[PDB]
Write a protein that binds this ligand. Structure first.
Ligand SMILES: Nc1ncnc2c1ncn2[C@@H]1O[C@H](COP(=O)(O)OP(=O)(O)O)[C@@H](O)[C@H]1O
Ligand SMILES: Nc1ncnc2c1ncn2[C@@H]1O[C@H](COP(=O)(O)OP(=O)(O)O)[C@@H](O)[C@H]1O
Ligand SMILES: Nc1ncnc2c1ncn2[C@@H]1O[C@H](COP(=O)(O)OP(=O)(O)O)[C@@H](O)[C@H]1O
Ligand SMILES: [Mg+2]
Ligand SMILES: [Mg+2]
Ligand SMILES: [Mg+2]
Lengths: 366, 393, 366, 366, 57
């Protein structure tokens, strides 16, 4: 019984190899009390921090894919094994996931904590973009993974990765949440605390969508009330938002809304295909796979199809593959990989790590 | 548990630097599928392309870099050299088989060759066709085996130039290879009729035989293991390269049977009895796959694969006495290209910098156990084991 | 059922004796991966390497008619017998082809592999120039065979070959491909990888031609757009070329474009005729046969006719014979030879070779 | 008083003929504001764009030795004449420099702008590799000029150029800067904007060096802190780099670090010598001249000496000539050439160009 | 430490921001695991590291 743990900047998906969905999906947050207790636990993790967030200061241990505090990162992993999955980590091999072009120093801490703190018998670290391609049943395609921290475009052809063509965008779900908070103040609603970030994130996941034509959608919102939607706050107060529904996801295609100089996700994907060999670009155009939670906006696949078609030659067939379960594609691909018989040769034992070190993890892995 | 218990699951190959290679070497162009390379802790022997007759290049291990085109070679054969094998008890003695239907034993000076070597120590003449198989006896001194294309195996005493045994009525077709067992009482062989045979030379009888070990018509190889089993490489009926483990006490079905790929070129197995690791190097391949032979099913356990971008024309393996123990090195392979010899180091990654007792047990020494006269009487002895801790620096 | 294998520097033409066209025509290339596989075959030959060339490094085992790596040369022959023709080589006699003035060491390796590695029952090696004369139904004439590696001019008179008059030109199809890649950077197109070599070779075979008058064509291309042609790359990008269409094949007649000191194909053919006896030059002028893929440029026969007419005396009749199937003239002439009755005395049995050696192959063959 | 203008992909060196160093050296950049002005010049060039780069988007008009925008290319030349040199271009003859194998269409635009836009009285275009050989006082030798856009190896013997042996490597200073940004993210430092590209380029010019033995240097950096250097960013923040100091210039010798299929600068130089005649290779081995800013790494000449010695025969004497002023060898050689009395016959007058055209510029020049 | 092992020894008066290039005790080839001042000498400190050695400074 192998464990598949997918640690992202915002959510932690964990479960067992062979299942179809993660058994445990909770926010990757650590909350600490910011008031004094007056009536006769110093930290809260995950959903227990989300239910007491009114008196807590919420912090994400992972920011932009970078672990800002490893002590809080161990609290997420300890909460995963003992509270969410309720397993003994020293009895199950664990398949971990890592971002593309992950620093070796980050992989060494992840391997050192799993073998020395949790004493897992075996371990393996897989690339998240490769697992997302396993879930779609493909060996060729460029994966655009946009989660909570960062956005990556990883081209893969016939099972071979092109690391020189991997592009990165410091713009994902958390930057869109902060942008929604900023433009919500333009409507009269003030969200400032870390507990209100989780409220705005819930507004974004429920009411935000990607407009096919942004300027026509801005004109429809200015001459009609058809695009307006209501949202009930935890205290019963109801707010109404109009063009903020499609202006927040528009920052994915126009990063200048955030004061950024980079290009949108559509040009980042196109520029990553152009960095590949000319003989593999045709298959990458027809196998553009979306992965992550930030790709779950309604209408993002039609907009992605329209923007890349305008960039690519007219004879190329642009095909955006957006599976309905792409929010868990990394975990599903890991559950598929950890169950293959040809994968059991990839496990790194704890006994092997104690005598050899992290050098065997830099090999064997990619 | 989850991971199979082993010490060599993370062995990785590493080619040496360009200044530690051997360039400007006209490697031989013979279609015969031998190793072309024989190396001991002292010299490096490579079968080279001679303008006339046959010759092979003997050069010290220190003589690295570009080799002079006029470097003296061991040019004594009138036909192209087919097989070369260093004597396990004498680092300066090497036997060579050629297409002139003869076997010559040579004595190399300690500092190498200054002038071309043309006269050998002894010319063993007993075969009617070309000799492409040569295997020194592991324990008996000055005992040499030769197998020509006339389908006959001959046992020689190099010290007296005598022919100890002639085994002519045992192979009906072309012999592929001959491998002695551990102590030297038996030897196995693969033949063109797809049959693997285990033969006792001193009694001239057939101990065991398995007909059609591999169904394909492409060549096979059969080597003896330390425990007494037979590891074979071959092709299936669908032209798929296979590995097979055989129990000589029960040859009805193979203990293991794994398929590797569907490439051409014969698979040359390099067995290391100290680590029980078989290195499979295909002729024309660019990769080296190593497997661990244990007692746990499926017996043949794939470890890893060293990959490169150049196909290998030959392959030599350094014995244990010449490896750098202080760096956790368990094998060194002298990969032959078409004009260069590139050593490849196999290393076990270990954090410790001390001597690894589990990696280096007692290996066979350069001291013979018996002699040619004692072995003929029927004496059987194990190879004399030495220690490798003294080699640690 | 005799096999007829025509191995060249660029293409491999194989089939069965008696047919009118080769059944298997694939590039003589070996491709090896140059990236690391990230998802759970180390070499590719022919079209399987041409379809995956985006992630491979392509190599020709034959360069300038010289086998640079026999291990990859056997992969071409194994791919021919088992993947292209799908026959057992131990059941069919194989007719092989050799370049003019072929080194004996090259023929010995070719014979030793066909008898020991593939175990063919019978075998014979024929001269490519003599086979090209069988395909045209002639016993007298000088053949200018220009393939992918080298260019030869072989005069033959009444079935007798004149080896002292055979001239060689280290300039053929592959040198024209490399020259097209160089002059395409002058137009703004950068082709550098071995996978882009195959793209430029495809541009050369479709858009290049030989100008009857080069200076008049350079003036027309400088004052008009009538000679410009477009070409679509595998990624859908369209490039346009103008004078590069007739400048690339012009290196055949002016080798100084490549920094070479040798003479063009027209002077090489004329110098080969002048090396023959005076009594046979008349029939050689009237029977100049073209052979090979490099002789397939539009207008190469009229330009060859114009140049040799200027060099030869005014009373001789220059006649350039360029059959429309001259790309496969060597194989066709081999399928004709292996089907005759007076040829069955030329086969060399595998049993004869095992007891005699390559000496019987040096005799019987020319 | 003739002017010597050396335009490169990265820096523009200008001055007066007869001086020992360029009087004006500024980056060949054009910066444009990417924010909105709120308080009561739409482009900046050179050092003025480098001082306001915090609010600008910086672009290079020349990429890989190719002018991508001629409007911004004329801004560099106008900034050179009027702002840097502060001269009237209609009064001084100008000596321009061009890359080896420069497209004629590129030279025509250069000549046309100098005569029609700036109205220079006389003009001449020299090859940068030939000028670098004038600066070292030689007529024989192969020049490896690696600047910011591209790398060229140009063999010259007795004043004769061998154009067929000129090789090109699409890998120079700007590709090493982009690679340094990529491996700096592996250490926790994120540089993404075009203004931070100029910061990473400044880290490269100050802290990067070439290791004599790369794998030995990687083992030294892995077991010690002696190779670590600090760098203060413009905002006072200090970063520390270790093995990235010699891993970035290592891409010059192992282009596979960038996913490139080409060979290193040492093999490109060796292959360029092997394309020359055998009777001139001995003098090219002993006269290997380095030129450009990318050849300014500490230890690049000893590594170049060590690598070419391993490729060349043992009886050849490899001698790498790296003058300490080789960053301006092209300009210095131009100032030397424009002052010779045997050069005044090479000027092309504006009156001659108006009546004849660029045909007189294609002749006279090479 | 970027390579090997090191530990930072700074006087108690040296407060505030510490220079990134401040000299450290970097004699170990592996990361330092434990440090301990000598109770009878305020200038002698011992350090254990992953290179399996104990260095007294
Ligand atoms: N239905 C949805 N619509 C829009 N955004 C969503 C939706 N569901 C999740 N998200 C966003 O996806 C982000 C994280 O998704 P995920 O792929 O799990 O990232 P990570 O891998 O970093 O955990 C969150 O910031 C969340 O706001
Ligand atoms: N239609 C064509 N026009 C011009 N060149 C061609 C054409 N077809 C093939 N070629 C060239 O001919 C060369 C090979 O022709 P061929 O004689 O079959 O090669 P070989 O005999 O050496 O295998 C190739 O380099 C290819 O570029
Ligand atoms: N001291 C140095 N060390 C390493 N690289 C340098 C140094 N000085 C300049 N460079 C690099 O040289 C490149 C440009 O040099 P130069 O030859 O002047 O370019 P160009 O010829 O295109 O004007 C720049 O990208 C810069 O990064
Ligand atoms: Mg994710
Ligand atoms: Mg041909
Ligand atoms: Mg320059």
């Amino acid at each position: 019984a192998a464990l598949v743990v997918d640690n992202g900047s915002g959510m932690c998906k964990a479960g067992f190899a062979g299942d179809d969905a993660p058994r445990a999906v909770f926010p990757s947050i650590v909350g600490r009390p910011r008031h004094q207790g007056v009536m006769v636990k110093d930290s809260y993790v995950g959903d227990e921090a989300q239910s007491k967030r009114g008196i807590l200061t919420l912090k994400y241990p992972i920011e932009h894919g970078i672990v800002t505090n490893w002590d809080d990162m161990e609290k997420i992993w300890h909460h995963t094994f003992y509270n969410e999955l309720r397993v003994a980590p020293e009895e199950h091999p664990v398949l971990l996931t890592e971002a593309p072009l992950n620093p070796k120093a980050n992989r060494e801490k992840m391997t050192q904590i799993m073998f020395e703190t949790f004493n897992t018998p075996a371990m393996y670290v897989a690339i998240q973009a490769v697992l997302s391609l396993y879930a779609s049943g493909r060996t060729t395609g460029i994966v655009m993974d946009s989660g909570d921290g960062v956005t990556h475009t990883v081209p893969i052809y016939e099972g071979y990765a092109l690391p020189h063509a991997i592009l990165r965008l410091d713009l994902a779900g958390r930057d869109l949440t902060d942008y929604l908070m900023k433009i919500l103040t333009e409507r009269g609603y003030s969200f400032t605390t870390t507990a209100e970030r989780e409220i705005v994130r819930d507004i974004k996941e429920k009411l935000c969508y990607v407009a096919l034509d942004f300027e026509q959608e801005m004109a429809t919102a200015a001459s009609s009330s058809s695009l307006e939607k209501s949202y009930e706050l935890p205290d019963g107060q109801v707010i109404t938002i109009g063009n903020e529904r499609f202006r927040c996801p528009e920052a994915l295609f126009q990063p200048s809304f955030l004061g950024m100089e980079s290009a949108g996700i559509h040009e980042t994907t196109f520029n990553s295909i152009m960095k590949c060999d000319v003989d593999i670009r045709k298959d990458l155009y027809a196998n553009t796979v979306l992965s992550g939670g930030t790709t779950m906006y309604p209408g993002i696949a039609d907009r992605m199809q329209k923007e890349i078609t305008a960039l690519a030659p007219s004879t190329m067939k642009i095909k955006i593959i957006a599976p309905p379960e792409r929010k868990y594609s990394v975990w599903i691909g890991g559950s598929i990989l950890a169950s293959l018989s040809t994968f059991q040769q990839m496990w790194i034992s704890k006994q092997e790590y104690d005598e050899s070190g992290p050098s065997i993890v830099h090999r064997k892995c990619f | 548990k989850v991971v199979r218990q082993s010490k060599f699951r993370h062995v990785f190959g590493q080619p040496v630097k360009n200044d530690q290679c051997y360039e400007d070497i006209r490697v031989s162009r013979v279609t015969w599928d031998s190793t072309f390379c024989a190396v001991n802790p002292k010299f490096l022997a490579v079968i080279v392309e001679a303008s006339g007759g046959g010759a092979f290049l003997v050069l010290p291990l220190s003589k690295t870099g570009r080799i002079d085109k006029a470097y003296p070679t061991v040019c004594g054969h009138t036909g192209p050299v087919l097989d070369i094998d260093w004597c396990p008890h004498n680092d300066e003695v090497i036997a060579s088989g050629s297409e002139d239907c003869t076997v010559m034993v040579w004595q190399i000076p300690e500092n190498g060759l200054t002038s071309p070597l043309t006269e050998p120590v002894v010319v063993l003449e007993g075969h009617t066709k070309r000799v492409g198989i040569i295997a020194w006896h592991p324990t008996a001194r000055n005992v040499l085996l030769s197998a020509g294309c006339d389908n006959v195996v001959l046992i020689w005493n190099v010290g007296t130039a005598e022919e100890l045994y002639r085994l002519d009525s045992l192979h009906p077709d072309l012999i592929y290879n001959v491998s002695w067992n551990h102590n030297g009482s038996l030897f196995c062989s693969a033949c063109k009729d797809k049959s693997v045979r285990i033969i006792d030379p001193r009694r001239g009888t057939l101990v065991a035989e398995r007909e059609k070990a591999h169904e394909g018509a492409r060549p096979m190889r059969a080597i003896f293991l330390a425990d007494g089993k037979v590891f074979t490489t071959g092709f299936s009926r669908m032209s798929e390269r296979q590995l097979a483990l055989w129990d000589p006490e029960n040859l009805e079905e193979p203990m293991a049977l794994q398929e590797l790929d569907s490439s051409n070129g014969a698979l040359l197995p390099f067995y290391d009895p100290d680590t029980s690791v078989v290195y499979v190097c295909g002729k024309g391949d660019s990769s080296i796959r190593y497997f661990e032979i244990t007692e746990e099913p499926p017996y043949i356990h794939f470890l890893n694969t060293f990959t490169s971008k150049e196909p290998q024309r030959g392959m030599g393996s350094m014995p244990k006495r010449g490896l750098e123990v202080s760096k956790c090195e368990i094998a060194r392979f002298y990969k032959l290209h078409e004009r260069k010899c590139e050593p490849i180091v196999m290393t076990v990654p270990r954090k410790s910098d001390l001597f690894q007792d589990d990696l280096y047990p007692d290996t066979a020494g350069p001291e013979a156990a018996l002699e040619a006269e004692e072995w003929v009487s029927g004496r059987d002895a194990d190879p004399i084991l030495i220690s490798l801790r003294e080699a640690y620096v």
